[PDB]
Structure formats: structure tokens, C-alpha cells
């Protein structure tokens, strides 16, 4: 009766209902239609049909798979419960806020999809060892905490930069494995789930980056230069850390050199989403056409 | 020094990836399965088939519909972009956090559903006048700001109470109209959308209410009695404000008395969702049979 009187006295402007009949930025509606039109749940893909394929894989291949998927789960958990949500208060339109709520939910769907895969293919000990490894891996924890330091900060623009780098770059050291296996006719149903996830992340990265550019272009030329400097500096740090993460996961298998090229290819895409030129020359980003297609 | 060095040192515990193979509270999984299994979009309902019955409605009915729907849109806008989200930080389990991301998203689908209805049935001036009315109505703004004062507060249990009361009580002064109209062959397709929303809100209130109960039972004797007193004080404050809002919406139509019974009926259900006895004797909650039948 009184507890809320102060709040009411300090918020005299009307609270407004979202009006979808009036859209000041057409992009918000285009992305909302795209994302909602692409709704899916992991229960829709028959992962159990990969059991034979999975049992045929070597212990090294299985271990690499558990670790990359656990790393991916951690990134989705962060993005869904902390990332997308941190973007809400800095939205330019109410329709953009609505889009972020869809992004948050689909991230939770993504994270859950990995457990569906594990629960269908792996043993309890394997699952347990995997989650423990993710808590102890220094590089995985470092990339997670670097991104979270920005979501927990007070610069709306840095939150969008961190979010775009996460969505367009950090997931890729992990996405290489299922896409490559898929090109060898292995774990094909699991790859279908991975493609649905990529189809979402691609749009998330594109959209959040678009919003970053709109905000940064409102600043002076000098300020804009500082944000670009910050973006590239953050990319150098994430790349350095991802290289070590990659070596540790893929050295046994011997896939490391190709995964590093894949990292550089996507790092360029991530920068492009933020409106900047790529960092690595094209000749250093070669990706197998069998991966690029099964990726799409 | 890296801008994130300190944050990494102020957060030693590892960041954990959600694991759906280990569920500390089965209710979280049960609710995630129900909510995700109930996914829907307003585009799936053929609202255009209601065009004829809409034009048949009286000026008083159309005006009441526009206003009630805008009020509902306002409440969904708040629940989706501020409410569900404010619950994340105090979740007991990570699976509970996932459920809130789905609730946030579906609240945005609910808000958009009303705009889909408007755009299909109403004129632009009617839509514009409705949103302006919602901005100027003191009772609607009052209930919205009271709820938001708790979401912006620092007491996690109060946020849950405010949320359950909004989901199990504040929506009903509005849900009454489409249920009344559909029993009289008016806006029957629009009523199918309303039922899908109610199907979601009934689970939301049941779930957030359940989490409130778990949390409050972990407190001392004095604190449990204080939260109970707080809950009844707020419920009465909200009911009082709702009476005024209801009279101003339905007096011209003359449906007010039956609507007030519906309010008392749902207020008791909301308190039951929070583990408490109802506030109104059963005999004061006898809504006409036609209304409850329409909900079925
Ligand atoms: Mn994701
Ligand atoms: Mn994403
Ligand atoms: Mn709703
Ligand atoms: Mn709800």
C-alpha cells in the first residue's frame, strides 16, 4: 500500500504495451519471423539411430566428442541465462526486446539438445567425466569468464560485441567435429541437430551485430575508433585462448591444423557481423567443401 | 592489465554447463516438457474467420474488446521483458532458469497474439485509440507499476508473489470478455487463442507459486508469517484496484457483477498457488456457468 509508493512517484512515464502494428525497425520483424518460423526441439531428431555409428567410433573420437559438446553446452547455458538477457535493457525498440526473449529460450533449447545426445549415446561415467572436465579446463573457463565479465559490466555496446563474438566465433572450434564426422557418414542424426543450432546462431550473430553497428554509428569518429580497437583487442585474446583449447581437444586425432583454419574463417565472419574487415587473409582460412556444405 | 582480469579473480568457482541428466527437482523437467510441448504461434489460428462476427458486435462490445486486449498486451509485455527475467538470479536450480527463458519467450508470443487479432479485425484509429487509452488509464498503469516495483526490487520471494498474482489473477478481468463472447458465437477463433494463452498462464502461476512455497518454507517462524501477511496485503491492494478497472471496462455493457465474481474466484486460486487459503468465501465466487463452460 506504501512499499511501492516511492517507485511509482519516481516512474511517472506510462508503461507501454508492445504494438506490432507499428514497427520502427523492419529488421526486428524480419528476424522475429525467421527465428520463430525456425522453432524446433531436439526430441524431433531421431538421435537413437546414431547408436551403431557411435559404438563404432574410437575412444579418442568419443572423448573428443564429449568434450566439444560439453564446451558448447556451457556456452549456450551462458548465452541463454546471462547473455541475451543482459541485452534487454539496452534495446532500441520493444520488438527488439521480444526477439531477445526468443534468443534466450532457443539457447536453453540448444543446451538441452546436447544432453539429449549424451543421454542417448554415452554412458553415465562418460557424461560425468565430461562435465567435470569442463569445470577444470582452464581455456574453457577462461573464455566463459571473459564473456561474462562484459555481460556483467555496464557498457551496452561491449555486451553486443562479446555476444556476437560468442555466437559467430567461440562455438566454431566445437562445431567442426560434428560437421567433419557428418562428411564421413558418422553421427548423421546428431549433425542434424547441430545444423538446426547453427541455423539459429547464424541469425543471432547477424542480428546482434547489426544492433551493435547501429549504436556505435551514433558516436563520434574518435569513439568509434576506440570501439573498433576494443573489438580487435578482444578478438586477439579469444583467438589466442581458442588455439590452445583447440590443440588440447584435437591434437590426438590430428585434426588441429584444419580446425585452426576453421577458427580463422569464422573469426572473419564474426568481425564482418560487427561491421569490420576480416582479420585473417583468405588463403589462411581454407575450409573443406564437404564441411562448408554440410554446414550451410 | 586486461579489463577482465579482476572479474576472473572475483569469480573462482567454475562456470557450470547445465546437465539434464541430473535433475534435483523433477518438477522443473515436468514443467519444461509441458510448456515446450504446448508451443504455439498466433498465426496458426484463422482469426480472419472472426471478421464477420466482429462487424456484428456492438460499438460497446468492440470498444471493451480493444481496451481489455490492450490491457492484457501491457501485462504480457511486462511479464516477458521484466518479470520472468527478474526471476532468473534467484533460481534454485539451473533447470528452473531454463524454464524461465521459455516463460519469457511465450509471454512475448502472447503479447504479439493480441496485435495479430487487432490487425486482422480492427481499424488503425481503433488500434491507436486503444494504446493511448492504456497509457492514460490510471488503474491499468497503477497495477503495472506496482508489479514492476517488485521486479525491480531486491527481495526474490516478493518477485515470485507478484508474478503468481499477475499470472493467476490480474489477467482474468480481461479473459472474461472473450469467454463471454465465444459462448454467444462471437470471436470464436480469437477465443481459441485466449485458451492457448490461459493454458500457458495456468502452468506459469502454478510453477512460480510452487517455487515461492519451497523458498518461504526455508525461513524462520517470524519471516514465514510476515511473507504470508505481505501476500494478503498485496492481493487486497490489487483486488481493490482491479474493481475500479473492471467497473470502468464493463459498466456500459452491464457485465460487471459477473466479472467481479470471476475476480474473486481467480484471486482464491492465485493464493492457493502460493500455498495459502483463499481470501473470499466460496459463496462469493459463483461465476455464471456459461463462463466456466467456455474455459472448458
Ligand atoms: Mn546456441
Ligand atoms: Mn545464439
Ligand atoms: Mn502471458
Ligand atoms: Mn504467463
From TrEMBL, chains A, B:
Going by the record, the broad EC class of this enzyme is oxidoreductase
Q: Which InterPro entries match?
A: Ferritin-like_SF, RNR-like, RNR_NrdF-like, RNR_small, RNR_small_AS, RNR_small_fam
Binding positions (Fe(2+) 1): 76, 107, 110, 201
How the cofactor is bound: the record states:
Binds 2 iron ions per subunit.
Annotated Fe(3+) 3 binding sites:
244, 247
What Pfam families has UniProt attached to this entry? Ribonuc_red_sm
Known catalysed reaction(s)? a 2'-deoxyribonucleoside 5'-diphosphate + [thioredoxin]-disulfide + H2O = a ribonucleoside 5'-diphosphate + [thioredoxin]-dithiol
Record-listed Mn(2+) 1 binding positions: 76, 107, 110, 201
Q: Which SUPFAM superfamilies does the UniProt entry name for this protein?
A: Ferritin-like
GO molecular function terms listed in the Swiss-Prot or TrEMBL record? metal ion binding; ribonucleoside-diphosphate reductase activity, thioredoxin disulfide as acceptor
- Residues binding Fe(3+) 5 are 247
GO BP terms: deoxyribonucleotide biosynthetic process
Binding-site positions, Fe(2+) 2: 107, 167, 201, 204
Residues given in the record as Fe(3+) 2 binding sites: 107, 167, 201, 204
Residues bound to Fe(3+) 1: 76, 107, 110, 201
- Per UniProt, Fe(3+) 4 binds at 244
Sorted alphabetically, the Gene Ontology cellular component annotations on this record are: ribonucleoside-diphosphate reductase complex
Catalytic residues identified in the record: 114
The record's annotation in CDD domains points to:
RNRR2 (cd01049)
Entries under PANTHER family matching the protein: RIBONUCLEOSIDE-DIPHOSPHATE REDUCTASE SMALL CHAIN, RIBONUCLEOSIDE-DIPHOSPHATE REDUCTASE SUBUNIT M2
Instruction: Quote the subunit structure annotation.
Output: Tetramer of two alpha and two beta subunits.
Q: What protein does this entry describe?
A: Ribonucleoside-diphosphate reductase subunit beta
Organism (species): Corynebacterium ammoniagenes (Brevibacterium ammoniagenes)
Amino acid at each position: 500500500s506504501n512499499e511501492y509508493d516511492e517507485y511509482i512517484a519516481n516512474h511517472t512515464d506510462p508503461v507501454k504495451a508492445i504494438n506490432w502494428n507499428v514497427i520502427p525497425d523492419e529488421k526486428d520483424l524480419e528476424v522475429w519471423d525467421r527465428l520463430t518460423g525456425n522453432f524446433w526441439l531436439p526430441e524431433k531428431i531421431p538421435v537413437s539411430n546414431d547408436i551403431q555409428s557411435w559404438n563404432k567410433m574410437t575412444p579418442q573420437e568419443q572423448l573428443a566428442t564429449m568434450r566439444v559438446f560439453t564446451g558448447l553446452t556451457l556456452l549456450d547455458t551462458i548465452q541463454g541465462t546471462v547473455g541475451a538477457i543482459s541485452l534487454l535493457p539496452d534495446a532500441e525498440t520493444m520488438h527488439e526486446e521480444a526477439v531477445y526473449t526468443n534468443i534466450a529460450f532457443m539457447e536453453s533449447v540448444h543446451a538441452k539438445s546436447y544432453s539429449n545426445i549424451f543421454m542417448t549415446l554415452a554412458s553415465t561415467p562418460q557424461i560425468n567425466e565430461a562435465f567435470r572436465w569442463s569445470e577444470e579446463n582452464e581455456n574453457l573457463q577462461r573464455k566463459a569468464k571473459i564473456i561474462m565479465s562484459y555481460y556483467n559490466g555496464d557498457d551496452p555496446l561491449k555486451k553486443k560485441v562479446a555476444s556476437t563474438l560468442l555466437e559467430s566465433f567461440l562455438f566454431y572450434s566445437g562445431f567442426y567435429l560434428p560437421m567433419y564426422l557428418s562428411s564421413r557418414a558418422k553421427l548423421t542424426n546428431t549433425a542434424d541437430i547441430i545444423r538446426l543450432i547453427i541455423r539459429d546462431e547464424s541469425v543471432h550473430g547477424y542480428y546482434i551485430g547489426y544492433k551493435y553497428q547501429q549504436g556505435v554509428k551514433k558516436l563520434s569518429e574518435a569513439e568509434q575508433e576506440e570501439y573498433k580497437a576494443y573489438t580487435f583487442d578482444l578478438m586477439y585474446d579469444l583467438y589466442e585462448n581458442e588455439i590452445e583449447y583447440t590443440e588440447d581437444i584435437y591434437d590426438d586425432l590430428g585434426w588441429t591444423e584444419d580446425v585452426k583454419r576453421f577458427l580463422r574463417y569464422n573469426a572473419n565472419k564474426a568481425l564482418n557481423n560487427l561491421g569490420y574487415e576480416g582479420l585473417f587473409p583468405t588463403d589462411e582460412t581454407k575450409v573443406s567443401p564437404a564441411i562448408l556444405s554440410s554446414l550451410s
